[PDB]
Write an enzyme that holds these catalytic residues in place. Sequence first.
Site, mmCIF file in Angstrom:
data_model
loop_
_atom_site.group_PDB
_atom_site.id
_atom_site.type_symbol
_atom_site.label_atom_id
_atom_site.label_comp_id
_atom_site.label_asym_id
_atom_site.label_seq_id
_atom_site.Cartn_x
_atom_site.Cartn_y
_atom_site.Cartn_z
ATOM 1 N N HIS A 72 30.918 36.755 42.554
ATOM 2 C CA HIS A 72 30.808 35.324 42.252
ATOM 3 C C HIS A 72 29.377 34.862 42.111
ATOM 4 O O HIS A 72 28.913 34.058 42.892
ATOM 5 C CB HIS A 72 31.513 34.504 43.341
ATOM 6 C CG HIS A 72 33.000 34.652 43.337
ATOM 7 N ND1 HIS A 72 33.670 35.518 44.176
ATOM 8 C CD2 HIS A 72 33.949 34.025 42.598
ATOM 9 C CE1 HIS A 72 34.973 35.422 43.954
ATOM 10 N NE2 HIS A 72 35.167 34.513 43.002
ATOM 11 N N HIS A 76 29.260 36.034 36.440
ATOM 12 C CA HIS A 76 30.661 35.651 36.430
ATOM 13 C C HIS A 76 30.857 34.248 35.855
ATOM 14 O O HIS A 76 31.798 34.053 35.085
ATOM 15 C CB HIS A 76 31.289 35.710 37.817
ATOM 16 C CG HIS A 76 32.680 35.150 37.855
ATOM 17 N ND1 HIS A 76 33.770 35.823 37.339
ATOM 18 C CD2 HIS A 76 33.148 33.955 38.292
ATOM 19 C CE1 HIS A 76 34.849 35.075 37.485
ATOM 20 N NE2 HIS A 76 34.498 33.931 38.043
ATOM 21 N N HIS A 112 32.387 26.044 37.876
ATOM 22 C CA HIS A 112 33.594 26.326 38.614
ATOM 23 C C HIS A 112 33.468 27.234 39.884
ATOM 24 O O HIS A 112 34.403 27.262 40.639
ATOM 25 C CB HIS A 112 34.675 26.837 37.631
ATOM 26 C CG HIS A 112 34.727 28.314 37.528
ATOM 27 N ND1 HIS A 112 33.731 29.038 36.914
ATOM 28 C CD2 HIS A 112 35.576 29.209 38.085
ATOM 29 C CE1 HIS A 112 34.000 30.320 37.073
ATOM 30 N NE2 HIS A 112 35.100 30.444 37.798
ATOM 31 N N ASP A 113 32.387 27.993 40.089
ATOM 32 C CA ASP A 113 32.174 28.823 41.325
ATOM 33 C C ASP A 113 30.766 28.648 41.945
ATOM 34 O O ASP A 113 30.310 29.415 42.876
ATOM 35 C CB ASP A 113 32.320 30.306 41.062
ATOM 36 C CG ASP A 113 33.719 30.804 41.140
ATOM 37 O OD1 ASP A 113 34.637 30.187 41.770
ATOM 38 O OD2 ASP A 113 33.994 31.873 40.547
ATOM 39 N N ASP A 230 39.067 32.520 33.863
ATOM 40 C CA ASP A 230 38.688 32.993 35.187
ATOM 41 C C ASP A 230 39.410 34.318 35.565
ATOM 42 O O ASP A 230 38.916 35.090 36.352
ATOM 43 C CB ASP A 230 38.999 31.896 36.199
ATOM 44 C CG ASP A 230 38.368 32.140 37.559
ATOM 45 O OD1 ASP A 230 39.090 31.970 38.552
ATOM 46 O OD2 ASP A 230 37.180 32.464 37.755
ATOM 47 N N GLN A 281 44.503 46.947 41.640
ATOM 48 C CA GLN A 281 44.285 46.461 40.273
ATOM 49 C C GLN A 281 45.639 46.464 39.547
ATOM 50 O O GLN A 281 45.967 45.516 38.867
ATOM 51 C CB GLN A 281 43.330 47.384 39.507
ATOM 52 C CG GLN A 281 41.905 46.881 39.237
ATOM 53 C CD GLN A 281 41.706 45.391 39.489
ATOM 54 O OE1 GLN A 281 42.163 44.567 38.712
ATOM 55 N NE2 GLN A 281 41.015 45.054 40.566
ATOM 56 N N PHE A 284 47.636 43.664 40.862
ATOM 57 C CA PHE A 284 47.014 42.418 40.457
ATOM 58 C C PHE A 284 47.480 42.069 39.042
ATOM 59 O O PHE A 284 47.940 40.975 38.804
ATOM 60 C CB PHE A 284 45.500 42.558 40.514
ATOM 61 C CG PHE A 284 44.774 41.332 40.152
ATOM 62 C CD1 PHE A 284 45.093 40.131 40.736
ATOM 63 C CD2 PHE A 284 43.754 41.374 39.224
ATOM 64 C CE1 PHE A 284 44.414 38.990 40.385
ATOM 65 C CE2 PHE A 284 43.073 40.239 38.870
ATOM 66 C CZ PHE A 284 43.395 39.052 39.457
HETATM 67 C C1 LIG Z 1 42.020 44.181 44.056
HETATM 68 C C2 LIG Z 1 41.097 43.243 43.303
HETATM 69 C C3 LIG Z 1 41.936 42.504 42.295
HETATM 70 C C4 LIG Z 1 41.091 41.779 41.294
HETATM 71 N N1 LIG Z 1 40.382 42.297 40.239
HETATM 72 C C5 LIG Z 1 39.790 41.284 39.540
HETATM 73 C C6 LIG Z 1 38.910 41.477 38.332
HETATM 74 C C7 LIG Z 1 40.161 40.095 40.205
HETATM 75 C C8 LIG Z 1 39.811 38.682 39.873
HETATM 76 O O1 LIG Z 1 39.098 38.463 38.915
HETATM 77 N N2 LIG Z 1 40.276 37.731 40.699
HETATM 78 C C9 LIG Z 1 41.252 38.085 41.758
HETATM 79 C C10 LIG Z 1 41.541 37.163 42.885
HETATM 80 C C11 LIG Z 1 42.804 37.414 43.429
HETATM 81 C C12 LIG Z 1 43.344 36.648 44.448
HETATM 82 S S1 LIG Z 1 44.776 37.102 45.018
HETATM 83 O O2 LIG Z 1 45.815 36.126 44.715
HETATM 84 O O3 LIG Z 1 45.110 38.385 44.427
HETATM 85 N N3 LIG Z 1 44.595 37.371 46.519
HETATM 86 C C13 LIG Z 1 43.363 38.090 46.902
HETATM 87 C C14 LIG Z 1 43.654 38.921 48.141
HETATM 88 N N4 LIG Z 1 44.157 37.978 49.131
HETATM 89 C C15 LIG Z 1 43.944 38.346 50.536
HETATM 90 C C16 LIG Z 1 44.710 39.619 50.867
HETATM 91 C C17 LIG Z 1 45.389 37.254 48.789
HETATM 92 C C18 LIG Z 1 45.180 36.457 47.499
HETATM 93 C C19 LIG Z 1 42.580 35.586 44.946
HETATM 94 C C20 LIG Z 1 41.316 35.303 44.383
HETATM 95 C C21 LIG Z 1 40.788 36.088 43.343
HETATM 96 O O4 LIG Z 1 39.577 35.780 42.799
HETATM 97 C C22 LIG Z 1 39.663 34.723 41.832
HETATM 98 C C23 LIG Z 1 38.600 33.668 42.074
HETATM 99 N N5 LIG Z 1 41.441 39.508 42.082
HETATM 100 N N6 LIG Z 1 40.930 40.470 41.212
HETATM 101 MG MG LIG Z 2 36.596 30.220 42.268
HETATM 102 ZN ZN LIG Z 3 35.772 32.182 39.071
#
Ligand SMILES: CCCc1nc(C)c2c(=O)nc(-c3cc(S(=O)(=O)N4CCN(CC)CC4)ccc3OCC)[nH]n12
Ligand SMILES: [Mg+2]
Ligand SMILES: [Zn+2]
Length: 323
Positions: A72, A76, A112-113, A230, A281, A284
């Site tokens: 962040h 980004h 936004h961040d 995002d 990933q 996700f």
């Molecule tokens: C394993 C990493 C996954 C991943 N890769 C990328 C590029 C990203 C991304 O851009 N943004 C997200 C990302 C994912 C979540 S979440 O819903 O997956 N989650 C995170 C883990 N927690 C605590 C266990 C629960 C909620 C939350 C915030 C995130 O960042 C966005 C600002 N995750 N992400």
């Molecule tokens: Mg954010």
């Molecule tokens: Zn962001």
Amino acid sequence: EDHLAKELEDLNKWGLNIFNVAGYSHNRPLTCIMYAIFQERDLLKTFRISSDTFITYMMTLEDHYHSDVAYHNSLHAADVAQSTHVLLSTPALDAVFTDLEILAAIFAAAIHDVDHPGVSNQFLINTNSELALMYNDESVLENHHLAVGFKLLQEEHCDIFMNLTKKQRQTLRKMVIDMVLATDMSKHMSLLADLKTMVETKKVTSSGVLLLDNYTDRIQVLRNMVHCADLSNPTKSLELYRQWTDRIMEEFFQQGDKERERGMEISPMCDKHTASVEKSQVGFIDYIVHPLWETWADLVQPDAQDILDTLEDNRNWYQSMIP
Ligand SMILES: CCCc1nc(C)c2c(=O)nc(-c3cc(S(=O)(=O)N4CCN(CC)CC4)ccc3OCC)[nH]n12
Ligand SMILES: [Mg+2]
Ligand SMILES: [Zn+2]
């Protein structure tokens, strides 16, 4: 320089490499990219925004993103801003938004961040941090990015919206607060649901363009536009996505380490001794990024197909990296 101009030829393209503009711009990818976007779209001339004021503001904004945070940081913010810029140019949304709606969407993307500390809302709430006491545990970080973002406009030599009318500042403000608060991941299932409803009753006029009756519908698409932007990382080329993945995972593992020094419960994915990056990933994309983007693709048929194909190849790549 030369290399920077060659890299900026792809400004209006999904394939732009923000990692490369970061290197050729002395690590000012946000200032850099925002200046390019604003010029290309004539936002500076349109809203009588002085080049000087605008750089001063973007430089200060860029300095409020922590360069010690792995994911962040201003890179980004710059990637989200440029992706939003490409998204506003989808053929399906041509001439739908006013310049003020365009101004707002890119301005939101950039802030936004801002001032992100490298930890999540749940971590700030669970550690009784100052910002969570301040914001009453609701969209703690998002409310803060907006406060910091707007606080920097309060000095004449930094007020980029000075020449807008009172009415346009009021509208732009509503729109930006609304878009940035929509980047809060706890609002993802609510947004995606309302976007799947937007698609079911979607109308497209004779020219191949979407019809958005009024403000309620336009700001809905904009909230979703920046939300996808995002989460645009797994839709880029496998080479950019692997670099983004290593960054975000560095941040998350850093958070797990903090959680570990305090005796807090570690979330199964921030736990570096166990968490499979590859599997996380794939989960996700399957449970969050693909449903969002598949829906966005439906709204903008067929402009986002290339993006969906890349997504499904990157997921398939990551899936092949686990025994
Ligand atoms: C394993 C990493 C996954 C991943 N890769 C990328 C590029 C990203 C991304 O851009 N943004 C997200 C990302 C994912 C979540 S979440 O819903 O997956 N989650 C995170 C883990 N927690 C605590 C266990 C629960 C909620 C939350 C915030 C995130 O960042 C966005 C600002 N995750 N992400
Ligand atoms: Mg954010
Ligand atoms: Zn962001």
